[PDB]
Design a protein around this nucleic acid. Structure first.
Length: 60
DNA sequence: CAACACTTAATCCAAA
DNA sequence: GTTTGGATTAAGTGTT
């Protein structure tokens, strides 16, 4: 395994913000989010994946 | 169709 | 001695 991630507020601010606009960001966006936050692209993809399921279950 | 790309639902697993 | 979410795995779908 690889070590798991922890986020700056400024970084989470960034992710939470972009999710406000598309729940399903395309790759060229994910790419920008990586550069912005200094993170890997995969992390971006899974954070969106995880916050998506979080919401589908609340609306049950 | 070949050849990859991406989602979804469920789960593992460690940090909080 | 519970709650939160990040990462992983095995099902799907979608794009080109």
């Amino acid at each position: 395994k690889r070590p798991r991630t922890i986020l700056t507020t400024q970084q989470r601010r960034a992710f939470k913000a972009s999710f406000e606009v598309s729940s399903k960001p395309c790759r060229k966006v994910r790419e920008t989010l990586a550069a912005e936050t200094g993170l890997s692209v995969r992390v971006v993809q899974v954070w969106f994946q995880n916050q998506r399921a979080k919401m589908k279950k609340l609306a049950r």
